[PDB]
């Protein structure tokens, strides 16, 4: 149940680097690697956005053991859920038992630039589109002919011809209680991120997951409880704090992060923050016991799949540090 993984940051690295880093994750003992799914990075200057599905396939072909998936992909606006279904069914066939689809309700930054017409929908409709799309994708993963007449999406006699016998597991990202309950009800997996305060995890997210599971008569023990642990570990404490600079946009409000449609405007807002405000969001440590105590909290709070997001450009260095300094402590 306890798994240790690596977050491959498409917002920060070009395609070949993003793939090699994930390969290095396996070399260094990681159980999983997850890739963000962006059309546009958070920053204009020095941002990247390699296509997530190409990363998954290239990494799958180069690895033997890593569990691979999106953290996370929005299957509802720029993407056609039927094509996403095909894509993941195909990767499920290529890399058996090694693929998951992580899903999210979306961010304007990926969607408005890519041609979505009119106003960025309110939360109710984005949440509503996500539930429906998950329905449709799973109906397709059955491998049977599908007639689907939803409020957002249609299918008439569609089949996925190549799909693994048990389909494709779905992990659901939630920043609040409403989607977390949905994840407890409907997800094979639950995704959240660290550093937003204990109350969020203990009082809102985990009770909502548990209550969703209860609502659908499910064992909560059966849901993979995954978190992206924002960690900046370096024996040089000056480097540990400074390394967080690139990730300044993640320190903006949820509202700014999901409604700002332009990287230029995003980066403007984000570079108003001093480094010591940005570091609020990150586990900043240069002692490994200090580091693992802080990571240990999430475990205590009910998360079992720990996906490590290190902020610096030197990812190979984080991975060496992780394998020698943190992994032995974290595994117990």
Site stretch for ligand F42 (CB under 6 A), options 25-33, 35-43, 137-145, 215-223: 35-43
Measure the CA angle with vertex 35, ends 32 and 37; round to 5°: 150
Query: Which residues in the 109-138 window bind its own copies by CB under 8 A?
Result: 112-115, 117
**Window of 82-90, 181-189, 298-306, 320-328 that interacts with its own copies by CB under 8 A:** 82-90
How many Å is the Cα radius of gyration of the chain? 19
Residue 277 structure tokens: 């405000």
For residue 62, the partner it binds in its own copies, ligand F42, none, with Cβ less than 5 to 8 A by kind, is its own copies
Counting every residue written for the chain, the total comes to: 332
Q: Is 28 a catalytic residue?
A: no
Of 23, 100, 36, the C-alpha closest to 64 is: 23
Q: Count Cβ neighbours within 10 Å for each residue of 25-63 and write b for 16 or more, e otherwise.
A: bbebebbbbbbbbbbbbbbeeebbbbebbebbbbbbeeb
* Strand 170-173 to 32-35 pairing: unpaired
Nearest 5 degrees, angle CA 35-CA 321-CA 231? Answer: 50
Alpha carbon 212 to chain centroid, angstroms = 20
Tell me the β-bridge partners of 201: none
Catalytic site residue from 38, 258, 305, 309: 38
The verdict on 72 binding its own copies (CB under 8 A) reads no
* β-strands 305-309, 224-233 pairing: parallel
Binding piece for its own copies, criterion CB under 8 A, among 127-135, 167-175, 208-216, 261-269: 261-269
What does 319 interact with, of its own copies, ligand F42, none (CB < 5 to 8 A by kind)?
A: none
Binding residues for coenzyme F420-(gamma-Glu)n: 37, 74, 105-106, 110, 175-176, 178-179
CA distance 258 to 227: 19
The footprint of its own copies on residues 272-311 (CB under 8 A) is none
50 is a contact residue toward its own copies (CB under 8 A): yes
Q: Which residues are annotated as a binding site?
A: 37, 74, 105-106, 110, 175-176, 178-179, 193, 196, 257, 281
174 binds ligand F42 (CB under 6 A): yes
The answer to whether 38 is a known catalytic residue is yes
Residues that bind ligand F42 (CB under 6 A): 36-38, 71-72, 74, 104-107, 110, 123, 173-179, 191-193, 228, 254, 258
Instruction: Report the interface residues with its own copies, using CB under 8 A.
Output: 14-16, 19, 39-41, 44, 47-51, 53-55, 57-58, 60-62, 78-80, 82-83, 86-87, 89-91, 93-94, 112-115, 117, 148, 153-162, 261-264
- Residues designated catalytic: 38, 107
């Amino acid at each position: 149940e306890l798994k240790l993984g690596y977050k491959a940051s498409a917002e920060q690295f070009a395609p070949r680097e993003l793939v090699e880093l994930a390969v290095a994750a396996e070399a260094h003992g990681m159980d999983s690697a997850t890739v963000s799914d962006h059309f546009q990075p958070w920053r204009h200057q020095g941002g990247h956005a390699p296509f997530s599905l190409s990363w998954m396939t290239a990494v799958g072909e180069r690895t033997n053991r890593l569990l691979l998936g999106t953290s996370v992909l929005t299957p509802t606006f720029r993407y056609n859920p039927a094509v996403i279904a095909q894509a993941f069914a195909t990767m499920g066939c290529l890399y058996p038992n090694r693929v998951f689809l992580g899903v999210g309700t979306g961010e304007a930054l990926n969607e408005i630039a890519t041609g979505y017409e009119g106003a960025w929908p309110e939360f109710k409709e984005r949440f509503a589109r996500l539930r429906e799309s998950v329905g449709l994708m799973r109906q397709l993963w059955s491998g049977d002919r599908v007639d689907f007449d939803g409020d957002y999406y249609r299918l008439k006699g569609a089949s996925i011809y190549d799909v693994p016998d048990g389909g494709v597991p779905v992990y659901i990202a939630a920043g609040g209680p409403a989607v977390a309950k949905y994840a407890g009800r409907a997800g094979d997996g639950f995704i959240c991120t660290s550093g937003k305060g204990e109350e969020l995890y203990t009082e809102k997210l985990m009770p909502a997951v548990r209550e969703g599971a209860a609502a659908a008569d499910r064992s909560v023990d059966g849901i993979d409880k995954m978190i992206e642990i924002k960690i900046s570990y370096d024996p040089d404490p000056e480097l540990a704090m400074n390394n967080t600079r690139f990730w300044a946009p993640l320190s903006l409000t949820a509202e700014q992060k999901h409604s700002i449609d332009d990287p230029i405007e995003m980066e403007k807002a984000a570079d108003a923050l001093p480094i010591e405000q940005i570091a609020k969001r990150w586990i900043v440590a240069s002692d490994p016991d200090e580091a693992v105590e802080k990571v240990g909290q999430y475990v205590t709070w009910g998360l079992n799949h720990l996906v490590f997001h290190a902020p610096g450009h030197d990812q190979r260095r984080f991975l060496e540090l992780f394998q020698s300094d943190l992994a032995p402590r974290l595994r117990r």
